[PDB]
């Protein structure tokens, strides 16, 4: 994990902010990722995360779902541009997702890889299926659901070891956050890879929309972000 600390000294000196949060990370007060989120700041410059999540750029926390070209007409023929769906996040607890556009497949991919650096959000975890009574973050804690477009889906815990079981453009974006074993009930139309992606990721957001009282914390081993490096 060396290079992904060398990048900190490579980057922190080679950039001046244009926003404010830029400063409040550049000058040594806030230096730990998990204390910038739950306060309603704004993320507009895509380096603040790199300076604290410097493994997001590793070509392995990065995943590229699909390229799809779209068309429109003008009175001089066709005009055509690409959209790629790209998601990223370290393989510990944090994931982000972006679309982007552009007129060439490169510019598209890079633009999207950048957009998906800002939205990035964090999770909870657990193990609370009726079998894995263990307490180690290898499954989503409690059955929750999320909606988008014309697709609903509700995730269910499951025992340590049952391999990922969801559609083929869900296995990636579940693998990134490392959620390994989880069972799937689908509705709607799973053939627009986009709304699929966005609905799954929305559910994983909603993971933090239910109140778990003090005691239940030590029933499923809920965590937040990294746990036991």
Under the rule (CB under 7 A), what is the footprint of RNA?
A: 72-75
- Among RNA, Zn ion, none, residue 75 binds (CB under 5-8 Å by kind): RNA
Number of residues that bind Zn ion (CB under 5 A): 5
The β-bridge relationship of strands 121-122 and 94-98 is antiparallel
Give just the sign of the alpha carbon dihedral 124, 128, 134, 139.
negative
CB of 157 to RNA, least distance (A): 23
Taking CB under 5 A as the rule, does residue 140 contact Zn ion? no
CB 200 within 8 A of CB 174: yes
Nearer to Zn ion, 109 or 144 (CB): 144
Taking CB under 5 A as the rule, does residue 177 contact Zn ion? no
CB 54 within 8 A of CB 5: yes
Pick the closest to residue 139 from 124, 126, 130 (CA basis). Answer: 126
Among 83, 101, 136, 152, binds Zn ion (CB under 5 A): 136
CA 85 to chain centre: 13
Q: Which residue has the tokens 């081993």?
A: 221
- Among RNA, Zn ion, none, residue 127 binds (CB under 5-8 Å by kind): Zn ion
CB of 153 to RNA, least distance (A): 17
Nearer to RNA, 28 or 77 (CB): 77
Residue list 114-133, contact with Zn ion (CB under 5 A)? 127, 132
Among 24, 118, 134, 156, binds Zn ion (CB under 5 A): 134
Tell me the sheet residues that pair with 156.
Answer: 183
CA 150 to chain centre: 21
> Rounded to whole angstroms, how far apart are CA atoms 172 and 196?
12
CB of 69 to RNA, least distance (A): 15
Nearer to RNA, 70 or 185 (CB): 70
Residue count of the chain: 229
Nearer to RNA, 34 or 79 (CB): 79
């Amino acid at each position: 994990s060396q290079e992904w600390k060398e990048y900190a000294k490579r980057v922190l000196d080679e950039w001046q902010p244009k926003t404010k949060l830029g400063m409040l990370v550049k000058e040594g007060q806030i230096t730990d990722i998990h204390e910038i989120f739950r306060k309603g700041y704004q993320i507009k410059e895509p380096e603040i995360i790199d300076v604290l999540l410097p493994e997001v750029n590793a070509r392995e926390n990065q995943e590229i779902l699909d390229i799809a070209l779209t068309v429109r007409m003008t009175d001089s023929g066709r005009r055509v541009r690409f959209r790629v769906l790209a998601a990223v996040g370290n393989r510990d607890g944090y994931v982000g997702l972006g679309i982007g556009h552009g007129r060439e497949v490169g510019i598209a991919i890079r633009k999207a890889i950048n957009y998906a650096k800002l939205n990035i959000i964090e999770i909870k975890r657990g193990c609370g299926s009726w079998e894995c009574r263990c307490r180690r973050p290898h499954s989503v804690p409690f059955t929750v659901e999320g909606k988008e477009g014309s697709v609903r889906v509700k995730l269910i815990p499951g025992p340590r070891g049952l391999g990922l079981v969801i559609g083929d453009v869900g296995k990636k974006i579940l693998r990134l956050a490392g959620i390994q074993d989880v069972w799937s009930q689908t509705l709607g139309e799973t053939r627009t890879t986009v709304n699929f992606a966005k609905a799954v990721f929305n559910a994983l957001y909603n993971t933090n929309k239910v109140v778990v009282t003090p005691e239940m914390i030590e029933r499923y081993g809920i965590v937040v972000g990294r746990a036991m490096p």
